[PDB]
Amino acid sequence: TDNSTAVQDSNGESWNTGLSINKGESAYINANVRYYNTGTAPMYKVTP
């Protein structure tokens, strides 16, 4: 006849890094532009 008793104490830590992307809208673009006038008259409300 045998009687046993065990006590176990455990500690742990974890680290997770992830990155996700949408393949249809992967990025957004910003174009820096300037308008030029090489004609004879001014233009108002310039809408290229």
């Binding site: 949408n22 393949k23 249809g24 809208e25």
Partner: protein, 48 residues
């Protein structure tokens, strides 16, 4: 307006219309009439 376009017989014959209209359509029998079509040149698929 014999041809049924937006311009009268006198306006067409006298040329007192938009100067970008072809001279053919200065004849009262020939309609001032744009024929506009669209062509596709390529197609881009974005899988989201």
């Amino acid at each position: 307006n014999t041809a049924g376009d937006p311009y009268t017989d006198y306006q067409k014959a006298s040329g007192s219309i938009d100067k970008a209209i072809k001279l053919e359509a200065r004849d009262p029998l020939v309609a001032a009439y744009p024929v506009v079509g669209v062509g596709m040149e390529n197609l881009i698929i974005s899988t989201n």
